[PDB]
Amino acid sequence: QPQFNEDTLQQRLQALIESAGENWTYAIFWQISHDFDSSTGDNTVILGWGDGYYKGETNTAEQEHRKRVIRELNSLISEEVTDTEWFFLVSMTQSFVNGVGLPGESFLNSRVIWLSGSGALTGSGCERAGQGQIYGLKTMVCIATQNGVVELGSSEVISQSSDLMHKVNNLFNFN
Amino acid sequence: LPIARRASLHRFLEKRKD
C-alpha cells in the first residue's frame, strides 16, 4: 500500500526470505537502468543488480579459486564457498537486456515465470535457469514489478503458493 | 564497483563471517 523506495529494499528482500514458509535460498532484485544507443537512437531498458539477500542453508582447485576471489573482494571492499553462494556472488555482475534471459523475459511481458524442478530449468532454453541448475538450484522464479524484477531461487523443488505471492505483493511496487 | 553491488558485497561478505 505504501510505494516503497530503495532505502527499504534490503529490508524487504530480507522480509521476503525470512518470513517465507518455504525454504528459499536467496532473493535478488534486478533494477531498471537505461542504455542509450548512439547508432540506433534507442533507449533500451537494461536490468542489472539492485540488491539481494542470501540465506543459504567442489574440487580443490575450484575452492582455492573461489576462496581467493572472496579474499580479493574482502580487500577492495575494505571456510568452504558453496555452489549457491558462488551463484549468488556471480549474479552480481550479470545484466539483462529487456526481453532477454529470465529477468528480461519477465520484465518485458510483466510476467511471473515459475520454474520448478531441474527439468523445468534445463528445458527452459534460458541461460540463467541453466546456470542456476548447474549450481544446484531446483526452483527459480522471476516476478516483474513496477521497478524491476524480483528473483527467488531454491535448491528445493517448490510449487507456487498463494502465501508466497501474497508476501511478494506486499513487499514490492505494482501498477 | 557500482554502489548497488558494493553495498550488497559488503553485506554478503560480512554475513559470511558467521
UniProtKB/Swiss-Prot annotation, chain A:
Of the GO CC terms on this record, one is: nucleus
Q: Which GO terms describe its biological process?
A: anthocyanin-containing compound biosynthetic process; defense response; extracellular ATP signaling; positive regulation of DNA-templated transcription; regulation of DNA-templated transcription; response to jasmonic acid; stomatal complex development
Q: What happens when the gene is disrupted?
A: Minor effect on jasmonic acid response and no effect on glucosinolate biosynthesis. Myc2 and myc3 double mutant has an increased insensitivity to jasmonic acid. Myc2, myc3 and myc4 triple mutant has no jasmonate-related defense response, is devoid of glucosinolates and is extremely susceptible to generalist herbivores.
Say if the entry is tagged with keyword Nucleus.
yes
**Primary location:** nucleus
- Domain of life of the organism encoding this protein: Eukaryota
Task: Cite the residue spans of the region called JAZ-interaction domain.
Answer: 39-78
- Mention one GO molecular function: DNA binding
Assembly notes: Homo- and heterodimer. Interacts with MYB28, MYB29, MYB34, MYB51, MYB76, MYB122, MYC2, MYC4, AFPH2/NINJA and the JAZ repressors TIFY10A/JAZ1, TIFY10B/JAZ2, TIFY6B/JAZ3, TIFY11A/JAZ5, TIFY11B/JAZ6, TIFY5B/JAZ7, TIFY5A/JAZ8, TIFY7/JAZ9, TIFY9/JAZ10, TIFY3A/JAZ11 and TIFY3B/JAZ12.
Record note on domains: The JAZ-interaction domain (JID) (82-141) is sufficient for interaction with MYB proteins and most of the TIFY/JAZ proteins.
Q: What protein name applies here? A: Transcription factor MYC3
Q: Which gene encodes it?
A: MYC3
Swiss-Prot record, chain B:
Q: List the disulfide bonds.
A: none
Task: Specify the domain of life of the species encoding this protein.
Answer: Eukaryota
Modification after translation: (Microbial infection) Acetylated by Pseudomonas syringae HopZ1a.
Q: Where is this motif: Nuclear localization signal?
A: 4-11
Give compartment(s): Nucleus; Cell membrane
Tissue expression remark = Srtongly expressed in root tips.
Location of the motif Jas: 2-18
Expression induction: Up-regulated by jasmonate, wounding and herbivory.
Residue numbers binding jasmonate: 4
Q: Which residues form a coiled coil?
A: none
Q: Quote the entry's note on domains.
A: The jas domain (202-227) is necessary and sufficient for interaction with COI1 and is required for TIFY 10A/JAI1 instability in response to jasmonate. The jas domain (202-227) is required for interaction with Pseudomonas syringae HopZ1a.
**Subunit composition and interactions:** Homo- and heterodimer. Interacts with TIFY10B/JAZ2, TIFY6B/JAZ3, TIFY6A/JAZ4, TIFY11A/JAZ5, TIFY11B/JAZ6, TIFY5A/JAZ8, TIFY7/JAZ9, TIFY9/JAZ10, TIFY3A/JAZ11 and TIFY3B/JAZ12. Interacts with COI1, MYC2, MYC3, MYC4, MYB21 and MYB24. Interacts (via tify domain) with AFPH2/NINJA. (Microbial infection) Interacts with the pathogenic Pseudomonas syringae HopZ1a protein.
Its annotated function is as follows: Repressor of jasmonate responses. Jasmonoyl-isoleucine (JA-Ile) specifically promotes COI1-TIFY10A/JAZ1 interaction. Interacts with COI1 and inositol pentakisphosphate to form a high-affinity jasmonates coreceptor.
User: Which family is this protein grouped under?
Assistant: Belongs to the TIFY/JAZ family.
Protein name in the entry: Protein TIFY 10A
Organism of provenance = Arabidopsis thaliana
Q: What is the lineage of its organism?
A: Eukaryota, Viridiplantae, Streptophyta, Embryophyta, Tracheophyta
